[PDB]
Design an enzyme around this catalytic site. Structure first.
Site, mmCIF file in Angstrom:
data_model
loop_
_atom_site.group_PDB
_atom_site.id
_atom_site.type_symbol
_atom_site.label_atom_id
_atom_site.label_comp_id
_atom_site.label_asym_id
_atom_site.label_seq_id
_atom_site.Cartn_x
_atom_site.Cartn_y
_atom_site.Cartn_z
ATOM 1 C CG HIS A 4 -12.632 -5.195 17.584
ATOM 2 N ND1 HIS A 4 -13.057 -4.000 17.045
ATOM 3 C CD2 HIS A 4 -12.152 -5.924 16.548
ATOM 4 C CE1 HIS A 4 -12.837 -4.003 15.742
ATOM 5 N NE2 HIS A 4 -12.288 -5.158 15.416
HETATM 6 C C1 LIG Z 1 -15.786 -6.223 13.079
HETATM 7 O O1 LIG Z 1 -15.144 -5.581 12.003
HETATM 8 C C2 LIG Z 1 -14.149 -6.097 11.506
HETATM 9 C C3 LIG Z 1 -14.211 -6.635 10.229
HETATM 10 O O2 LIG Z 1 -15.068 -6.166 9.478
HETATM 11 C C4 LIG Z 1 -16.429 -6.506 9.634
HETATM 12 C C5 LIG Z 1 -13.036 -7.105 9.655
HETATM 13 O O3 LIG Z 1 -13.093 -7.704 8.584
HETATM 14 C C6 LIG Z 1 -11.820 -7.041 10.324
HETATM 15 C C7 LIG Z 1 -10.704 -7.917 9.789
HETATM 16 C C8 LIG Z 1 -9.918 -7.140 8.758
HETATM 17 C C9 LIG Z 1 -9.309 -7.825 7.608
HETATM 18 C C10 LIG Z 1 -8.550 -9.107 7.785
HETATM 19 C C11 LIG Z 1 -9.467 -7.213 6.236
HETATM 20 C C12 LIG Z 1 -8.125 -6.982 5.549
HETATM 21 C C13 LIG Z 1 -8.401 -6.325 4.218
HETATM 22 C C14 LIG Z 1 -7.453 -5.390 3.593
HETATM 23 C C15 LIG Z 1 -5.976 -5.637 3.682
HETATM 24 C C16 LIG Z 1 -8.022 -4.211 2.834
HETATM 25 C C17 LIG Z 1 -7.135 -2.970 2.825
HETATM 26 C C18 LIG Z 1 -7.551 -2.125 1.639
HETATM 27 C C19 LIG Z 1 -7.515 -0.655 1.674
HETATM 28 C C20 LIG Z 1 -8.021 0.107 2.863
HETATM 29 C C21 LIG Z 1 -6.993 0.105 0.479
HETATM 30 C C22 LIG Z 1 -5.671 0.767 0.846
HETATM 31 C C23 LIG Z 1 -5.019 1.337 -0.391
HETATM 32 C C24 LIG Z 1 -3.698 1.983 -0.322
HETATM 33 C C25 LIG Z 1 -3.151 2.529 0.966
HETATM 34 C C26 LIG Z 1 -2.870 2.111 -1.576
HETATM 35 C C27 LIG Z 1 -3.262 3.371 -2.336
HETATM 36 C C28 LIG Z 1 -2.757 3.268 -3.756
HETATM 37 C C29 LIG Z 1 -2.899 4.381 -4.707
HETATM 38 C C30 LIG Z 1 -3.753 5.578 -4.395
HETATM 39 C C31 LIG Z 1 -2.178 4.298 -6.031
HETATM 40 C C32 LIG Z 1 -1.126 5.394 -6.157
HETATM 41 C C33 LIG Z 1 -1.274 6.061 -7.509
HETATM 42 C C34 LIG Z 1 -0.144 6.333 -8.418
HETATM 43 C C35 LIG Z 1 1.270 6.436 -7.910
HETATM 44 C C36 LIG Z 1 -0.463 6.552 -9.885
HETATM 45 C C37 LIG Z 1 0.602 5.968 -10.808
HETATM 46 C C38 LIG Z 1 1.717 6.972 -11.005
HETATM 47 C C39 LIG Z 1 2.425 7.127 -12.288
HETATM 48 C C40 LIG Z 1 3.767 7.802 -12.263
HETATM 49 C C41 LIG Z 1 1.817 6.607 -13.575
HETATM 50 C C42 LIG Z 1 2.768 6.681 -14.767
HETATM 51 C C43 LIG Z 1 2.898 8.100 -15.271
HETATM 52 C C44 LIG Z 1 3.649 8.426 -16.497
HETATM 53 C C45 LIG Z 1 4.241 7.359 -17.377
HETATM 54 C C46 LIG Z 1 3.826 9.878 -16.875
HETATM 55 C C47 LIG Z 1 5.202 10.354 -16.432
HETATM 56 C C48 LIG Z 1 6.221 9.916 -17.457
HETATM 57 C C49 LIG Z 1 7.557 9.447 -17.062
HETATM 58 C C50 LIG Z 1 7.744 8.520 -15.898
HETATM 59 C C51 LIG Z 1 8.748 9.912 -17.859
HETATM 60 C C52 LIG Z 1 9.417 8.746 -18.580
HETATM 61 C C53 LIG Z 1 8.432 8.090 -19.518
HETATM 62 C C54 LIG Z 1 8.183 6.644 -19.445
HETATM 63 C C55 LIG Z 1 6.781 6.122 -19.546
HETATM 64 C C56 LIG Z 1 9.330 5.690 -19.285
HETATM 65 C C57 LIG Z 1 -11.778 -6.487 11.603
HETATM 66 C C58 LIG Z 1 -10.496 -6.372 12.374
HETATM 67 C C59 LIG Z 1 -12.945 -6.019 12.187
HETATM 68 O O4 LIG Z 1 -12.976 -5.829 13.400
HETATM 69 S S1 FES Z 2 -13.387 -2.032 19.976
HETATM 70 FE FE1 FES Z 2 -13.052 -2.009 17.800
HETATM 71 S S2 FES Z 2 -14.705 -0.772 17.026
HETATM 72 FE FE2 FES Z 2 -14.770 -0.498 19.211
#
Ligand SMILES: COC1=C(OC)C(=O)C(C/C=C(\C)CC/C=C(\C)CC/C=C(\C)CC/C=C(\C)CC/C=C(\C)CC/C=C(\C)CC/C=C(/C)CC/C=C(\C)CC/C=C(\C)CCC=C(C)C)=C(C)C1=O
Ligand code: FES
Ligand SMILES: COC1=C(OC)C(=O)C(C/C=C(\C)CC/C=C(\C)CC/C=C(\C)CC/C=C(\C)CC/C=C(\C)CC/C=C(\C)CC/C=C(/C)CC/C=C(\C)CC/C=C(\C)CCC=C(C)C)=C(C)C1=O
Ligand SMILES: COC[C@@H](CCO[C@H]1CC[C@@]2(C)C(=CC[C@H]3[C@@H]4C[C@@H]5O[C@]6(CC[C@@H](C)CO6)[C@@H](C)[C@@H]5[C@@]4(C)CC[C@@H]32)C1)CO[C@@H]1O[C@H](CO)[C@@H](O[C@H]2O[C@H](CO)[C@@H](O)[C@H](O)[C@H]2O)[C@H](O)[C@H]1O
Ligand SMILES: COC[C@@H](CCO[C@H]1CC[C@@]2(C)C(=CC[C@H]3[C@@H]4C[C@@H]5O[C@]6(CC[C@@H](C)CO6)[C@@H](C)[C@@H]5[C@@]4(C)CC[C@@H]32)C1)CO[C@@H]1O[C@H](CO)[C@@H](O[C@H]2O[C@H](CO)[C@@H](O)[C@H](O)[C@H]2O)[C@H](O)[C@H]1O
Ligand code: HEC
Ligand code: HEC
Ligand code: HEM
Ligand code: HEM
Ligand code: HEM
Ligand code: HEM
Lengths: 403, 16, 232, 194, 403, 204
Positions: D153
């Site tokens: 950038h």
């Molecule tokens: C030069 O460079 C550059 C480029 O590049 C070269 C670029 O391109 C860009 C331009 C940039 C862009 C435009 C790109 C944009 C792209 C994106 C948006 C990408 C972003 C992606 C990421 C970085 C990933 C981020 C991920 C996140 C933060 C989310 C994380 C999610 C998890 C880890 C999931 C969470 C897990 C869970 C909760 C598990 C599930 C839980 C349960 C409870 C399961 C169920 C369990 C049960 C059922 C058991 C328990 C039982 C229960 C509930 C009891 C009741 C039972 C029942 C079942 C009802 C720029 C600026 C840049 O300058």
């Molecule tokens: S200005 Fe974005 S990587 Fe350095």
């Protein structure tokens, strides 16, 4: 919120689906222990999908690193051992729950009209599950993984003409190697999960189209009140939702007990030889399938001929597809079928269990004799069904469910 | 205590 | 016929002695490459500096895997069989099998390395603990008399009543540093360390599972009440 | 059904829902926790000894320190005289808000003026800026006096690692903890003696 | 077959679904060029799923082997080069088709009532596609891949307090490494494909619930024949199925031309520096995003502050979500909106294209100034919509579709 | 910098064979082509397997092995100050014109560690390894007379053949791609007419 739901309902049939599938969807009120296993199968499928997605974050589908990546999950990844045990125990519990589900279908004639398509979708689900579990068991790349994959894919070498070429094409190599590992990983991680999800959707849709069976085999839809609700019917939500919540809690108690105290389950959920890295040049003294494949293995081992054994193993699964047309009983539930049907269901269950038990061990004289006898009985349960379902005398099905 | 428990088996006699 | 061993994974001293035995007498041929020195030190309670000084002989870092210089192909050529990685050997064979195997080596001139094993006949492993155990042979020694499970101990002294048997593992006297009990304890500590290495999450698994089961019992009480009620 | 006991039903539904939510959080704990740095990630890194006597005037070398590139640039005189002339274009000329060893010059951000050791990672989204020692490139404008230009950038730093104003990068390029083991040999990763 | 379909229909909602969704589903008859892109997006999604499944059979999601496994696909796997080119060109074509789809929505007010949920599900699909494409672009583990992952994950580092911890947790490591590569592979190959399939299903279900807009913006449901079929309505099957077949063939012609003659497309579909293996210590002198991410990158590059640039990019995408409520025009289609709406839609298109063009090259003075002007125009298109959609004078909407 | 255009012909088996010879002799000392196999290079260049093993495989590797080299990237980065990148995909990373101008733009610069600089790649860490062939080139670039085996035209052909082989190495599927693409496009044009007619028939 009332206004939010009104806004959504004008744009999405949310309330309509909820009242068509869960609420205002009247299932028979006499479901028993045997009707917990569809919801438990859904829970185990969700568990497999989640834990598999997380294992994939750390697993390496290469013959050089698959076993090392599994150990990396088991030791280096925070709580990775928990996720891995959830996945292995969940595969074993998937097969336990699915076998009990299928046995409920056998018990209460749930495959009969109008649920023939439900049964066929369920059997497609079973085929997809078997393929998924088989391809997953190769992923750890242990001795059992490698050699079970070797034998199972050599089975495709038994086809008289195209067998060897087909086996090589499936392997992607002249032997089981990292190419086969990566290929089965791709199939197991995306393709078969997608197929299974679609098949489960179709299965539940067909069921909801024709409605659930019940332990008494009573067609509850015949008797309806002035509001159109079956007299023996209760809304699935909330009554069976809370019942299934209780069942899910019990299943989770057992599942977590296994995960945290007996993840190997005496070497049946996690086989001991599979903790040794795959060795292309040393095969285990006795190679056996995972327990949930053992019955069919026994059938294949019971047939002295190789091609005939493969054909018999395939037919052992294919006959369950035609089961809906093999059953000629005027009644659905085993409770009101004649003594012959009860006897043959007992024989089939015992033969299946014995086939699984003797397919998990090295061949033995008594083991081989009983495996052959149980193969005969397993196939006779289906082949003789169209006859002994007619010869027997059935009890009159009650107009209202009992309880 | 741990150090004594963990002493390497091979002992080498060194000049001086 | 295996011999039972009661392995205590909560015994830090025993696991430390087993780790020392593994690092000295075992890592010459066997790797523990699925296991890091850092985690072994953390779980056994060994200070990181102490682990570096006493158990890491290969110049690896604390966070490195317990790799060794002996390549599997080279060792397979040299011994006739590749010495397997021993991180999971406790899970592959079990602790009783390991305990019986490491104490079942006996001199056998017919074999490439002059020894055989009762548990693992015609094993390609040399008897590397012979200096500790001493010379063990298939000879004649006193064994407790047993008649259809009728095992005779001495009522007064509480020691076994024995008769001579001529196909038993006997250690030649004054041939090893450790007596039978001391070598038994050495092998027990080694197998305890191997059991820890195969399943390093066992204790934490039991703790977490206890808490999970307590929570699930609580949740079951609530779900059962919500079910039986609402089913009236 | 005869006279459903509300409140009891509401209480049981609420309690079961809360307990199930707690269980859901617990079952999420493995999945969220597995995303934190594992034992593989925590291997860390040791200090790197770099021989800096062979760096030609106005040139720079990359040292691999803890997985990051360190720009070790042998600064000629002219750019050292030019650096004070840039203070009006720099967000933090005195390095009040940047990360650097307490013993480096606040302005030159190095132990010795003729050599600059800079953690070569841009302070905006973290990429190693391109080294542009030239005086007045056409693309970098006539006011350029040498420094660094982030290719992501377009983040201007001067040769001391100090960020220009109005730039995606808010901070000066970090200065790693390093010492001079010898007149021509430095070590990155260990602080210098007081 | 008649008997077979009668058997199925008593057990499955086959014919009813076919006649509710595809046949006997009366869409406006005046769909033009801009209405090809929903079916084309479906086709590109199917292509991405299939080609990605086949790539996963040979890809190694490890920092040591990802680039090598990609070259193995290109060189050792029979026709693997074809599959990889289908996949990369299909990602580029997915964004081309999706952008044209969104622009159709802008042109004809297809986001307006009653299609607000359709638009919101479409935006969720677009977010999932952005994430999917970004995570896929990391998988080759080229220089482009590594440094784009580094920048985009460090974006989360801009959050004032939890930013650095969140970025470290997303990485799974203190820097972009094989942990990040493997985690992103897992998310790309299963989690987000599943989410995208679900979101596409929800999107199409919402569309079928509220019905399709048309270029004239005429609500064809107002006028119906005696049979209840809209006067301007035609059954989607067979007429629009065959029209979409023609569109699919044209798209396939262009797609295969690119695959087999211009797979790189001048370095815009397959970037030249991504053919170099990822180097943690050497940042490419021109580290630019894939073309379809350039317009937002430009927006981030146009803002002098780090956190404000990240917010401006986030807000560039998030603003499209609230579009159904920003447009207060009394008419849907741009054909009958006032001069202000037409001028501002032209301004938005030009600004988006200019941002993408200058976001695709290294910073320049004119480039920076135009990026900054187009960043303000892009946002003004949305922020001023609630005003200039009321200030303008709209032409009367015809009671029948023109054509 | 300004590049010199070169017309690369990937159907010229002789030119690609000469380029492969030059790459194996003068370039594989420091650069790997580890993403392509000797067997596939032989097949695509029309080189018999035995001839390929005898004439181009110097590392003792098998015909089916990747064109790996002994010089490890870390050691080379230490020695030269920069790692010699794998050249399998360099024709795609840089382009054939850039390679052609770069391999002909080495001149003598005593201030540099290896006594040479490059017009295309200033301050490059490459030693001028083709100096024996081109001769002594000094700064406009001029070759000192009677200092290399080849003249300007002969050296340009050598670089052109080498760049042609590099061009093939980066994209070994180009010829098979253009052949398959022609039939795919012919089928799609054939299929379009039937699809277009079918649509026209229904929309009456
Ligand atoms: C030069 O460079 C550059 C480029 O590049 C070269 C670029 O391109 C860009 C331009 C940039 C862009 C435009 C790109 C944009 C792209 C994106 C948006 C990408 C972003 C992606 C990421 C970085 C990933 C981020 C991920 C996140 C933060 C989310 C994380 C999610 C998890 C880890 C999931 C969470 C897990 C869970 C909760 C598990 C599930 C839980 C349960 C409870 C399961 C169920 C369990 C049960 C059922 C058991 C328990 C039982 C229960 C509930 C009891 C009741 C039972 C029942 C079942 C009802 C720029 C600026 C840049 O300058
Ligand atoms: S200005 Fe974005 S990587 Fe350095
Ligand atoms: C000791 O040992 C033993 C054990 O072990 C230890 C055992 O356990 C057992 C016991 C064994 C068991 C019971 C276990 C059972 C396990 C299993 C069942 C495992 C079996 C699994 C396998 C071996 C896998 C086999 C897989 C096979 C054969 C299937 C292969 C599938 C493919 C390769 C798919 C083909 C790909 C295709 C067709 C691509 C898609 C093509 C397209 C056309 C895509 C669309 C393209 C377009 C749209 C473009 C063209 C456009 C068109 C059409 C024009 C019009 C446009 C429109 C779109 C309309 C035994 C006996 C044993 O002794
Ligand atoms: C020696 O002692 C024999 C004991 C019986 C047994 C196991 C033996 C050889 C073939 C076995 C049959 C092959 C057919 O396979 C099956 C399935 C395949 C069908 C095509 C034919 O029927 C059997 C019903 C039939 C079958 C599985 C039943 C049992 C047969 C060994
Ligand atoms: C400092 O201003 C930068 C420009 C003018 C800056 O124009 C502005 C043009 C508009 C734009 C894009 C800008 C900020 C925020 C943007 C908004 C945020 C909100 O977000 C959204 C979405 C989110 C919602 C929550 C809110 O709404 C929007 C609707 C809103 C929004 C996206 C709309 C548009 C806004 C920049 C002036 O640049 C000078 O020139 C040099 C710049 O580098 C600096 O010179 C130094 O550094 C040089 C190194 O090159 C050397 O050459 C010199 O020697 C050395 O002295 C000098 O310091 C600097 O002043
Ligand atoms: C501590 C002194 C040691 C223990 C405990 C074990 N080893 Fe070894 N070992 C060696 C070879 C060449 C083999 C393979 C022999 C064959 O396959 O026939 C082995 C094998 C084992 C096994 C068997 C594991 C299994 O799954 O069958 C165990 C449990 C075992 N070893 C434990 C060689 C060597 C060696 C080289 C001189 C040393 C120093 C050790 N072994 C040390 C130990
Ligand atoms: C060791 C003596 C080398 C031999 C012989 C050859 N090359 Fe080289 N190469 C070497 C180094 C140390 C470098 C890096 C220089 C730097 O400053 O980064 C290179 C680089 C190249 C490149 C640049 C590729 C790129 O930047 O992406 C090319 C195109 C290249 N080398 C080509 C090449 C050819 C054709 C050779 C045989 C005639 C050859 N190299 C030999 C080290 C050495
Ligand atoms: C019906 C669903 C599934 C079943 C029955 C199943 C079964 C299995 C089994 C039995 C194993 C062997 C485990 C072992 O012994 O170590 C395994 C491994 C694995 N599975 Fe699956 N699986 C399913 C779904 C999935 C999904 C959806 C994914 C990823 C999206 C996945 C990813 C993995 C991975 C990465 C491994 C290797 C790691 C390991 O072995 O634990 N699985 N699977
Ligand atoms: C493997 C994943 C599966 C899932 C998630 C699943 C899901 C369900 C659910 C939720 C139900 C309703 C509740 C119940 O009856 O338990 C159901 C019913 C049914 N299932 Fe399954 N199923 C699976 C596999 C199978 C298989 C393998 C079969 C048989 C081969 C099968 C046959 C049936 C039948 C016949 C019914 C309805 C019968 C009745 O109403 O009593 N299903 N399924
Ligand atoms: C990426 C995968 C997508 C698929 C597979 C898909 C699918 C479809 C299909 C088949 C249609 C009906 C036929 C057509 O309009 O061409 C449609 C309509 C529509 N789509 Fe999507 N879509 C996708 C993404 C999006 C996105 C990103 C947006 C907006 C942000 C969106 C918004 C809409 C709207 C507003 C309509 C209604 C158009 C009208 O009635 O005139 N869709 N979509
Ligand atoms: C909307 C759907 C998808 C999009 C937009 C997408 C996009 C991408 C992109 C842009 C790349 C970079 C390719 C390159 O630069 O060479 C990639 C790589 C990859 N994708 Fe996806 N992808 C999608 C779905 C999938 C699925 C479902 C799978 C697996 C089932 C998959 C498997 C892969 C693999 C293995 C790679 C690395 C190999 C390669 O780069 O060709 N993708 N993806």
């Amino acid at each position: 919120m009332n206004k939010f739901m009104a806004w959504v309902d004008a744009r999405f049939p949310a309330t309509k689906m909820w009242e068509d599938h869960l609420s205002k969807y009247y299932a028979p009120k006499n479901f028993n222990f045997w009707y917990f296993f569809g919801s438990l199968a859904l829970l185990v499928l969700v568990n497999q999908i989640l834990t598999g997605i997380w294992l994939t974050m750390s697993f390496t589908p290469s013959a050089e690193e698959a076993f090392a990546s599994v150990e990396y999950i088991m030791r280096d990844v925070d709580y990775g051992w928990i996720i891995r045990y959830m996945h292995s125990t969940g595969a074993s519990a998937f097969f336990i729950v699915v076998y009990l589900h299928m046995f409920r279908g056998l018990l209460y004639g749930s495959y009969q009209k109008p649920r023939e398509l439900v049964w066929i979708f369920g059997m497609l689900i079973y085929l997809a599950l078997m393929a998924e579990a088989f391809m997953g068991y190769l992923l750890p790349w242990g001795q059992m993984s490698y050699w079970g994959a070797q034998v199972i894919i050599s089975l495709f070498g038994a086809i008289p003409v195209v067998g060897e070429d087909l086996a090589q094409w499936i392997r992607g190599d002249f032997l089981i190697s990292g190419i086969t590992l990566n290929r089965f990983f791709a199939l197991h991680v995306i393709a078969l999960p997608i197929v299974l999800l679609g098949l489960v959707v179709l299965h539940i849709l067909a069921l909801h189209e024709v409605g659930s069976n019940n332990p008494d085999g009573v067609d509850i839809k015949k008797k309806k009140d002035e509001n159109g609700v079956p007299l023996d019917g209760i809304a699935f939500h909330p009554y069976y939702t809370v019942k299934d919540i209780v069942g899910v809690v019990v299943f989770l108690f057992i599942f977590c007990t296994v995960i945290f105290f007996f993840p190997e389950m005496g070497g049946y959920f996690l086989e001991k030889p599979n903790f040794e890295m795959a060795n292309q040049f040393k095969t285990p003294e006795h190679i056996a399938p995972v327990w949930y494949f053992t019955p069919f293995y026994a059938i294949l081992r019971a047939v002295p001929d190789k091609l005939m054994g493969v054909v018999a193993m395939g037919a052992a699964i294919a006959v369950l597809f035609v089961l809906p047309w093999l059953d000629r009983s005027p009644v659905r539930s085993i409770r009101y079928k004649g003594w012959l049907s009860k006897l043959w269901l007992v024989i089939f269950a015992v033969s299946f269990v014995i086939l699984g038990y003797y397919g998990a061990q090295a061949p033995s004289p008594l083991g081989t004799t009983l495996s052959r006898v149980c193969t005969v009985l397993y196939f006779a349960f289906f082949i003789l069904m169209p006859f002994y379902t007619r010869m027997e005398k059935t009890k009159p099905v009650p107009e209202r469910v009992t309880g | 205590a741990i150090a004594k428990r963990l002493e390497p088996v091979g002992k080498v006699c060194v000049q001086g | 016929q295996l011999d039972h061993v009661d392995i205590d994974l909560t015994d830090k001293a025993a696991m430390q002695d087993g780790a020392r035995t593994f690092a000295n007498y075992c890592m010459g041929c066997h790797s523990a490459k699925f296991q890091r020195y850092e985690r072994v030190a953390t779980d056994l309670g060994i200070p990181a500096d102490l682990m570096m000084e006493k158990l890491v002989f290969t110049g690896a870092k604390i966070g490195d895997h317990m790799d060794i210089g002996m390549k599997p192909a080279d060792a397979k050529t040299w011994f006739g069989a590749a010495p397997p990685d021993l991180t999971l050997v406790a899970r592959v064979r079990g602790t009783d099998w390991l305990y019986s195997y490491l104490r079942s080596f006996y001199e056998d001139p017919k074999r490439p390395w002059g020894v055989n094993n009762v548990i693992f006949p015609n094993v390609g492993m040399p008897n590397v603990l012979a200096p500790l155990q001493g010379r063990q042979v298939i000879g004649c020694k006193q064994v407790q008399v047993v008649e259809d499970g009728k095992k005779q101990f001495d009522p007064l002294t509480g020691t076994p009543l024995t008769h001579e048997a001529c196909d038993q593992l006997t250690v030649v006297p004054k041939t090893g540093e450790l007596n039978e009990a001391q070598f038994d304890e050495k092998v027990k500590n080694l197998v305890t360390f191997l059991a820890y290495s195969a399943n390093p999450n066992k204790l934490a698994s039991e703790r977490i599972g206890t808490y999970v089961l307590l929570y699930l019992a609580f949740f079951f009480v609530f779900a059962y009440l919500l079910k039986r009620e609402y089913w009236k | 059904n005869d006279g459903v006991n509300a409140g009891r039903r509401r209480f049981l539904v609420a309690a079961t829902s809360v307990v199930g939510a707690a269980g859901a959080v617990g079952a999420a704990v493995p999945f969220v926790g597995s995303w934190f740095p594992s034992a593989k990630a925590k291997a860390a890194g040791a200090p790197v000894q770099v021989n800096v006597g062979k760096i030609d005037p106005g040139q720079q070398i990359i040292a691999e320190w803890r997985g990051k590139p360190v720009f070790i640039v042998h600064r000629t005189k002219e750019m050292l005289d030019a650096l004070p002339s840039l203070e009006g274009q720099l967000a933090d000329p005195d390095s009040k808000a940047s990360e650097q060893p307490e013993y480096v010059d606040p302005k030159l951000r190095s132990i010795k003026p003729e050599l600059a050791v800079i953690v070569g990672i841009c302070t905006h989204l973290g990429c190693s800026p391109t080294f542009r020692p030239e005086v007045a490139p056409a693309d970098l404008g006539p006011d350029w006096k040498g420094g660094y230009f982030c290719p992501c950038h377009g983040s201007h730093y001067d040769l001391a690692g100090r960020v220009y104003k109005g730039q995606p990068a808010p901070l000066n390029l970090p200065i790693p903890p390093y010492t001079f083991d010898a007149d021509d040999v430095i070590t990155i990763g260990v602080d210098q003696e007081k």
